[PDB]
Curated annotation (Swiss-Prot):
Functional note: Hydrolase that can remove conjugated ubiquitin from proteins and therefore plays an important regulatory role at the level of protein turnover by preventing degradation. Converts both 'Lys-48' an 'Lys-63'-linked ubiquitin chains. Catalytic activity is enhanced in the M phase. Involved in cell proliferation. Required to enter into S phase in response to serum stimulation. May regulate T-cell anergy mediated by RNF128 via the formation of a complex containing RNF128 and OTUB1. Probably regulates the stability of STAM2 and RASGRF1.
Organism: Homo sapiens (Human)
Domain notes: The MIT domain is required for endosomal localization, CHMP1B-binding, maintenance of ESCRT-0 stability and EGFR degradation. The rhodanese domain is sufficient for RNF41-binding.
Post-translational modification: Tyrosine-phosphorylated in its N-terminal half in an EGFR-dependent manner. Ubiquitinated. Inactive form is mostly monoubiquitinated, but polyubiquitination happens too. Ubiquitination is increased in EGF-stimulated cells. Ubiquitination of active form is undetectable, suggesting a possibility that USP8 deubiquitinates itself, thereby regulating its own function.
Sections of the chain in a coiled coil: none
Induction cue: Upon growth stimulation in starved human fibroblasts. Decreases in response to growth arrest induced by cell-cell contact.
Protein location: Cytoplasm; Nucleus; Endosome membrane; Cell membrane
Residue ranges of every copy of the Rhodanese domain listed in the record: 29-147
Family assignment from sequence similarity: Belongs to the peptidase C19 family.
Coverage span on the entire protein: 174 to 317 of 1118
Protein name, as recorded: Ubiquitin carboxyl-terminal hydrolase 8
Amino acid sequence: GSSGSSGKCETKEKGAITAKELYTMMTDKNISLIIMDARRMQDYQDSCILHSLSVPEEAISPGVTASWIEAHLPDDSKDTWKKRGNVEYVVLLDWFSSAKDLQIGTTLRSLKDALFKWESKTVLRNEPLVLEGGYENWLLCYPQYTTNAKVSGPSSG
């Protein structure tokens, strides 16, 4: 080579995490990591990953802060919520919304920006990443890592 000709490129992940990476960190004592499910309150009841956190979808608004979410969260989730600053890395979940399908209004986006971008006191080491596919894909990757595996989530049509 002389300088470096252009091409096309394929693998170009940006602000995204895979299920495989979550496992390596999920069972890591040296590396902390918390998982959150930005979905409806009913979704958490039907399906929910073990050793994971939960957060309503309505409670998370586009352009909110930590005080907002912290104000609207479960009783047991409120604990791990505060540990967000103690841990190192962070990850989220979803049904059909990846980091590429994120927009100005999505729960993941508003939650991803309301954890670092809209920070005042607590601060993390990196930026919140979204799992590849979310819970829908987590079942296909590791169905033996959730409280409820018998959960079907077909498409709109």
